Amino acid sequence: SANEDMPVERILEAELAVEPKTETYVEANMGLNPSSPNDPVTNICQAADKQLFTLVEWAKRIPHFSELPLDDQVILLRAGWNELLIASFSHRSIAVKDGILLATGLHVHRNSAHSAGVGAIFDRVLTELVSKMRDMQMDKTELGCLRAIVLFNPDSKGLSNPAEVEALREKVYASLEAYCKHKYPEQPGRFAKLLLRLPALRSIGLKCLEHLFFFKLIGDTPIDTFLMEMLEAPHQMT
């Protein structure tokens, strides 16, 4: 266990860098200061784009990640994006109840996901991840370290050097325990409690891929506001 090879402060920085601005959260949910038009395709493409940025800007800021062969960096991001995205929108949603806050600042309510056909996956996110993170008062350093552990997956298919990725993973969890021990001495089993949210992240990630949850999650509100305009507009042709 050591913090020099994997500083938790440098891991917290990576998480803070990609954190949405307060103005993003406010604008999205008030419909204010739109850059974007009421076109569903544009809005979906912009949301996907903002999510990709969050994952890539975060990863590059993780210690030693950019020292891996570029081929391995692509494989790790492509193999873990689903889980990385889920862990990120789960922790961001701790303050909110019955909903998810996306990288665009948008709040997707439980009800919208239930009418969208993704209700059960959404409830698994709320229950298995969001509630659990809120109860332990999981901090952004802990999230950061959980996400770097997901990132540094030595089991990803196609890696040139799996031993390097595995050595990088070990350092993250060695720093995570040192951090947990020093900040939460009253909680001796917190490190395990954190690592034990990863199997749920794994199953949820697979279930999201099978149901087009990412597509429906980012596509639902843009479809609603577009239809709202058409329904609110006056009578048309013939």
Would you mind telling me the total number of residues written for the chain in this entry?
A: 238
Residue ranges of alpha helices (H) inside the chain are 8-17, 22-30, 40-60, 70-91, 110-116, 119-124, 132-135, 140-151, 162-183, 190-195, 198-211, 213-232
Which is closer to a second copy, CB of 50 or CB of 197? 197
Residues 23-82 that bind ligand CPS (CB under 6 A): 23, 26, 28-32, 34, 36-38, 43
Q: For residue 164, which of 61, 60, 71 has the smallest C-alpha distance?
A: 71
Joined together, the tokens standing for residue 157 give: 């298919």
Residues 193-232 that bind a second copy (CB under 8 A): 193, 195-196, 198-203, 206
Query: Least distance (Å) from a second copy to the CB of residue 8?
Result: 15
Say whether 78 counts as a known binding-site residue: no
Residues 139-178 that bind a second copy (CB under 8 A): 149, 155, 169-170, 173-174, 177
> Given candidates 74, 192, 209, 228, which one binds a second copy under the rule CB under 8 A?
192
Which partner from the list ligand CPS, a second copy, none does 127 bind, CB cut-off 5 to 8 Å by kind? a second copy
Q: What residue type is 81 in one-letter code? A: W
Three-state DSSP at 109 gives: strand
Three-state DSSP at 61 gives: coil
Which partner from the list ligand CPS, a second copy, none does 37 bind, CB cut-off 5 to 8 Å by kind? ligand CPS
Q: How many Cα atoms sit within 13 Å of 65 on the Cβ side?
A: 25
Instruction: Tell me how far apart the terminal alpha carbons of the chain are, to the nearest angstrom.
Output: 75
Number of residues lying near ligand CPS (CB under 6 A): 22
Which partner from the list a second copy, ligand CPS, none does 234 bind, CB cut-off 5 to 8 Å by kind? none
Say whether 92 counts as a known binding-site residue: yes
- Sequence-distant (6+) residues with CB within 8 A of 84 are 55, 58, 77, 147, 150, 151
* Interface ranges with a second copy (CB under 8 A): 1, 127-128, 149, 155, 169-170, 173-174, 177, 188-189, 191-193, 195-196, 198-203, 206
Binding residues for all-trans-retinoate: 92, 103
* Interface ranges with ligand CPS (CB under 6 A): 22-23, 26, 28-32, 34, 36-38, 43, 104-106, 221-222, 225, 228-229, 232
